[PDB]
Design a protein around this ligand. Structure first.
Ligand SMILES: C[N+](C)(C)CCOP(=O)([O-])OP(=O)(O)OC[C@H]1O[C@@H](n2ccc(N)nc2=O)[C@H](O)[C@@H]1O
Ligand SMILES: C[N+](C)(C)CCOP(=O)([O-])OP(=O)(O)OC[C@H]1O[C@@H](n2ccc(N)nc2=O)[C@H](O)[C@@H]1O
Ligand SMILES: C[N+](C)(C)CCOP(=O)([O-])OP(=O)(O)OC[C@H]1O[C@@H](n2ccc(N)nc2=O)[C@H](O)[C@@H]1O
Ligand SMILES: C[N+](C)(C)CCOP(=O)([O-])OP(=O)(O)OC[C@H]1O[C@@H](n2ccc(N)nc2=O)[C@H](O)[C@@H]1O
Ligand SMILES: [Mg+2]
Ligand SMILES: [Mg+2]
Ligand SMILES: [Mg+2]
Ligand SMILES: [Mg+2]
Lengths: 228, 228, 228, 228
């Protein structure tokens, strides 16, 4: 009944070079501070101190967080071999009642809560139009579908929460998926998207400047100015 | 009698995620330069300016090529429906005396030529042992067979040329194929390999670091260093 | 106190060629039925028999409507010289308590009513992202702003109603505009968008398949399938 | 110095439904014979064998002509996106000393000649009065002007021949036009009509039953009887 946080931070983050040439993405800094720190401090300040960080590319640079925040680091040796599906596979049983977080995000405000009662997707609305995973939901905010597409709307923004019963249904797809031998290129998120029919997930529309994703030096350049 | 180039680049490139989530594999860059640019600039330098690029997945990202190199982009709306047999089908009439290229390859050296006089496959030798399409030829370099298999040897490496008489035989197979009703999974190469007996094709043994394919983030990791 | 309709239909419809070289867009047919007929029959069925159609390009092809529906056609001789600002100027006095309709739109449902009491824009939400005129409004549905831009949102969809007091303020802008000497490229809609601050306009969100615009032969192709 | 022909046959011919539902316009048949066959055979019998057919809508139904008459087919992928300006753009290099033909015309007689020495328009006289493009020429038959209008006179009838120098002047407009960004709606003929001042084109008055156009099920119904 205690809420923990899983942070996916193993990737190479090649789209951000030269910035990530000798620095993992998660530890890239804005307003003179590492990206992963903002989320760790927001998670702790909200009483979520059970924090597991999946590492890989340049993992030695994370070691100091154990001492500083008391985070549990976990090594994915296949961080360049597979996609983050495997990273989550590694801690596939800690999913229940835990937050899953894409480390490459800048959080403007702390939207975390240990009172969460159901599987949630913390969705921001992209007025523009880029290729993302889009959430298809009604007035009950229950997620009807997830669709990859290029357009505008509410997307999977890199922060979610999975309750025990749903997590259980998910882990069962992870096993089959893994044993299938076909998951290399799969995002852990494919488990939900391709099985959304069997799961009950809800959206939590965020607003204003909240979760800014940095997938390229240009974004880093934008968020830079937004912070002006 | 003018040599033209057809570049296949409409695929999802899923085996390259996350690198290819918001960037076509064809446009992924090595040494701050899109893959497709090395090939186009190589083609041009050798006098081949009649370039037709088939696009689909994230097509909008190719638009700047038109203005920059004077290329022609063609949209395959079934790019996620069918294998690249359909991509070639769309331009099946521009085959004769044209090069056909797999855009997801890195070329170390410009092995192109507008003087080519016969159907050629620029094959590389794979000393290791992976599963590919192996070229079976004698001392005349005339292709005797093409066999899918896991081993070492000379392989279809993503670059070839087709003369008018050969293209004609091919395009006739493409038609029956199309009208057959079944061609979803066929690579356009299934046209040759499955009728190699009726065609006259020659091999052009490449050597050293010539054509480097990136079908996975590891290869992309490798190639990086090779260029160290 | 009687509701009348004003249908703009004088345009060249060049973006629909060849479909429109010998037929006005307003008369192009979907399901063996001219576009303008769907609107007129909907307007009539809800008691709006006071219909005024401005025509120009290929005007002679509208003449049968007079006999068939009892509509009044008004000839805009500058239909190729000026944008529809002038088309409405012609009938700027019949504005009060009347619908203003862009003829080049298909209507899936009859959203016309003779009980309207305030100025309304019947809007559709565009999930994709094209360049249009966007409606900026609150929870009162009172229009706060109208912006030209390319994105998603609620857009002016070619159907609106204007009440006496609002029509009065608008007609006063038309006059000044006309006598200003510059109005060649102005949509009649410019009168509202550029004085939205002095006017009280409300939105009436439309849902589902309601108002489909055919501004190109592709759309005409789409709408085709939609009705599959 | 060899004369070739370019037949434009990519459009959708919607105005001809139901006749063109599962048949391209060029392959709608009169006297159990496809329209494009009459023009191909007249063109051959006069020694013009260098025939390039531009296809699109239902293109597969043309493949047989390659074997049968040895015509070269060409695929315009934007056949429903743009007007035939683009279709001609694809082969803008084969214009010089070549006939340009609108495949939706029934030829009563073979007015083709490989001896042509100057840009020509094989004009017919319409005693009636429809909206078409009219040739304004003097007694020297040199075209002074082309004007869209609704009346009687000599029109652009769907057959013409262009010489090297004129075609050279026309191709330079085609280029600026394309790079302009706006041609989406231009007929290839717009190049001639909106530049007629810079070109030397002549008229070749046809007489009696020569070229009958089928743009609608009404025309087809007429021609039917004329042949009675
Ligand atoms: C498509 N989605 C919405 C499901 C997720 C989008 O993911 P993406 O395309 O931005 O790629 P990304 O690598 O930046 O994914 C974000 C998170 O996955 C992590 N990651 C990636 C690959 C890998 N083997 N292990 C990981 O832990 C990254 O470090 C990063 O923190
Ligand atoms: C099996 N062979 C030897 C014939 C070739 C190997 O082909 P492959 O297995 O690497 O799969 P692949 O999808 O990468 O094929 C390479 C090229 O096909 C293109 N491609 C693929 C599918 C599709 N519908 N259209 C395409 O244009 C890709 O963009 C890529 O440039
Ligand atoms: C820009 N908006 C949002 C104000 C409206 C969009 O208008 P549009 O860009 O689609 O151009 P359009 O020509 O289709 O305008 C729609 C209506 O105006 C009519 N029209 C246009 C010009 C003119 N001189 N007289 C007219 O009556 C057309 O016939 C058509 O029924
Ligand atoms: C206005 N003119 C005089 C310039 C030509 C008249 O042209 P039209 O109004 O009869 O329309 P149309 O679609 O029949 O044009 C005739 C020829 O263009 C071809 N066509 C049309 C659209 C397109 N993208 N490519 C084409 O090649 C048609 O197949 C047809 O054979
Ligand atoms: Mg990311
Ligand atoms: Mg490949
Ligand atoms: Mg319109
Ligand atoms: Mg015609």
């Amino acid at each position: 009944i205690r809420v923990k946080a899983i942070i996916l931070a193993a990737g190479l983050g090649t789209r951000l070079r030269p910035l990530t040439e000798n620095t993992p993405k998660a530890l890239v800094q804005v307003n003179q501070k590492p990206l992963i720190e903002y989320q760790i401090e927001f998670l702790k300040e909200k009483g979520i101190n059970d924090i597991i960080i999946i590492v890989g590319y340049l993992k030695e640079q994370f070691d100091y967080l154990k001492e500083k925040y008391g985070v549990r680091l976990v090594f994915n040796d296949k961080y360049a071999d597979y996609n983050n599906f495997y990273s989550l596979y590694l801690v596939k049983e800690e999913l229940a009642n835990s937050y899953v977080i894409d480390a490459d995000n800048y959080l403007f405000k702390n939207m975390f809560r240990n009172d969460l009662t159901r599987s949630t997707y913390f969705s921001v609305y992209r007025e523009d139009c880029t290729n993302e995973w889009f959430l298809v939901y009604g007035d009950d905010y229950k997620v009807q579908d997830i669709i990859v597409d290029s357009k505008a709307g509410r997307i999977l923004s890199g922060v979610s929460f999975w309750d025990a019963p749903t997590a259980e249904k998910i882990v069962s797809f992870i096993d089959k998926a893994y044993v299938s031998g076909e998951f290399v290129d799969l995002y852990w998120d494919n488990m939900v998207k391709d099985n959304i029919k069997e799961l009950d997930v809800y959206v939590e529309e965020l607003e204003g400047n909240s979760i800014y994703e940095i997938d390229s030096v240009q974004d880093y350049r934008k968020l830079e100015e937004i912070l002006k």
